[PDB]
Design a protein around this ligand. Structure first.
Ligand SMILES: Cc1cc(-c2cc3c(=O)n(C)cc(-c4cc(C(C)(C)O)ccc4Oc4ccc(F)cc4F)c3o2)cc(C)c1OCCO
Ligand SMILES: Cc1cc(-c2cc3c(=O)n(C)cc(-c4cc(C(C)(C)O)ccc4Oc4ccc(F)cc4F)c3o2)cc(C)c1OCCO
Lengths: 108, 110
């Protein structure tokens, strides 16, 4: 509950403008419809992005910091699972995760 | 089943401690010898240490009910690295590079 106020702090930093170069594809859920990804939801069974995570933080859905991470990592995993590992979205994901895991480990 | 999950978690561990990734995998092969490295506070800051040999033993001993628990320890390993070290330092770059092989390999796992 005091540690969730930090998890919020992380989400805030994840969405700040510094990282926006590589963070943006995770602000909004994947638009599989528009991108023509007919198979996206057959493979990604539990979509997740940072907006969906924010709603949940607002709605007090995350009990501990562990549940918060679960979803944030799930975002990145969905990216690695669906996408060939060369593609740039993967290399951005990696970039953003690297910041995440930074702040999460630092968290008191 | 659930032991089909773990079969693949074995395949991931194998990859992680293999030939190719050795450049950046080696500081996680065995525990952090704080004593030797002159780290008078490592075990103060890191309450639950973790490394790949430890993971490997647990995988043999069958302490992991599922991949979800396996991942847990691997993530914990990388976490501790990131927790203890400032972000510039080289270990971290390697930690990061190995985590990227894992999440790749883990996320592919049918
Ligand atoms: C065009 C295309 C896109 C994607 C794909 C995967 C994937 C993904 O995992 N995430 C998290 C985000 C995107 C993505 C999302 C969006 C919107 C604004 C619609 O939400 C826009 C572009 C996206 O993908 C990118 C493609 C190339 C990039 F350099 C960067 C991207 F973010 C996204 O796109 C995957 C494939 C295979 C693809 O190519 C279609 C086959 O040629
Ligand atoms: C000497 C020293 C070492 C560490 C440190 C942190 C850290 C770590 O998080 N992991 C996972 C692994 C090592 C590490 C461990 C080992 C052994 C074989 C003893 O287990 C050997 C080297 C290690 O780290 C490196 C030190 C210097 C390098 F140029 C590269 C390293 F991988 C490791 O070393 C951190 C600091 C700040 C440090 O400087 C202490 C005062 O000089």
């Amino acid at each position: 509950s005091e540690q969730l106020k930090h998890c919020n702090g992380i989400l805030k930093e994840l969405l700040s403008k510094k990282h926006a170069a590589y963070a943006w594809p995770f602000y909004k859920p994947v638009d599989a419809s528009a991108l023509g990804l007919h198979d996206y939801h057959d493979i990604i069974k539990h979509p997740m992005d940072l907006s969906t995570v924010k709603r949940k933080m607002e709605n007090r859905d995350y009990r501990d910091a562990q549940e918060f991470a679960a979803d944030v990592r799930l975002m990145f995993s969905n990216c690695y699972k669906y996408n060939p590992p060369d593609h740039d979205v993967v290399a951005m994901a990696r970039k953003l995760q690297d910041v995440f895991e930074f702040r999460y480990a630092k968290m008191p």
